Amino acid sequence: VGSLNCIVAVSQNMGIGKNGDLPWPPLRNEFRYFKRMTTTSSVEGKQNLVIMGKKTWFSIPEKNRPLKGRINLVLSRELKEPPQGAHFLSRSLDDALKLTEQPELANKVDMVWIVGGSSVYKEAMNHPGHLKLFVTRIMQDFESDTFFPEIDLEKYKLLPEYPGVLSDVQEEKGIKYKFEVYEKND
Ligand SMILES: NC(=O)C1=CN([C@@H]2O[C@H](COP(=O)(O)OP(=O)(O)OC[C@H]3O[C@@H](n4cnc5c(N)ncnc54)[C@@H](OP(=O)(O)O)[C@@H]3O)[C@@H](O)[C@H]2O)C=CC1
Ligand SMILES: Nc1nc(N)c2cc(CNc3cc(Cl)ccc3Cl)cnc2n1
Known part of the structure; x- marks a missing residue:
């Protein structure tokens, strides 16, 4: 399995979401960047894996779900099976990361992209190890309820x-x- 990565777009006041939607109006080339970065696998015959919380999954318009070209894993301790259109379900980040080392996924995953939301970012970022953050800095404040x-x-x-x-x-x-782009290794 290749690198571990977070990718986020965030406003000056650290805002990433408001009522299950983005705080700012659609930025089309910013969407294109997100797609390009999470989809492009550096290794032939492999796809990247995207990991996201339940609320992030449901924040994506149904037509855009699953994120195409990528393996889609949702985090939830309530759900008993992957949501319609999702590929995998885990009960924790450690569990998700552990699954990528299994028979079924070891050979299939290139890079892993954590794509939201708050608590999944938080845990990933304070876990020891080699990690990158792809952060788009939206250079205005925007009313937000998720940071x-x-x-x-x-x-x-x-x-x-x-x-x-x-x-x-x-x-x-x-x-x-x-x-x-930020990088830690610890
Ligand atoms: N600007 C950007 O880059 C991004 C913005 N967003 C936005 O953020 C918001 C959604 O984010 P947020 O509210 O933080 O929610 P999440 O997407 O993190 O979903 C939270 C829920 O997912 C489960 N969950 C989260 N972490 C774990 C874990 N480690 N293990 C098991 N289950 C977990 C839940 O389910 P359960 O109760 O079923 O166990 C928990 O209630 C929306 O506004 C969305 O638009 C999202 C990503 C990026
Ligand atoms: N940089 C960056 N980082 C993220 N994690 C992002 C995540 C999203 C998630 N939302 C979303 C996804 C699709 Cl494919 C279509 C419509 C929507 Cl609203 C949107 N933009 C992002 N930008």
Whole structure:
């Protein structure tokens, strides 16, 4: 199995969600970036795995579910089987990560992408090990009810460049944003 990664878009006030929707209006090229990054597998004959909480799964329009080209795993201790259209269900992140080492998945998964929400990010980010954060910085405040956890810059280094990631300021719908990559290894 390849790298472990979080990817998020987050406003200045650390906001990632409001009422099961994004706090800002649709940013089309930001969506394209999310798709490109989670879908592109560096290893032939493999797909990337996406891991997400139950509320993140249901936040995705039904037509966009499952995230296509990727293996879709949902985290839930209430659900007794994967949601309609999902591929796998786990009861914890450790369980999810453990499953990728099983007969069924060992050979099939390239990179793993944690794509939400708050508590799954939090746990991933404070788990020892080699981890990257792909963070799109939406450079305005937006009313939110769900937030990205604190990024501890003593551990997470902001990378000065990354292949495939634009370094300059982007702008869609009057909303400025920029792509960042962080890395820890501990
Ligand atoms: N801006 C961005 O990049 C992103 C924004 N979002 C947004 O955030 C919101 C959804 O996020 P959030 O509310 O944080 O919810 P989550 O997607 O994390 O879902 C939380 C639920 O998933 C289960 N769960 C979460 N973590 C675990 C775990 N470790 N083990 C087992 N089950 C777990 C739940 O189910 P149960 O009660 O069934 O056990 C728990 O109640 C929406 O607004 C969405 O639009 C989401 C991703 C990215
Ligand atoms: N950078 C970044 N990181 C994430 N985790 C994101 C996650 C989402 C999830 N939402 C969503 C997904 C699909 Cl495919 C279609 C419609 C919606 Cl609303 C949206 N944008 C994201 N951007």
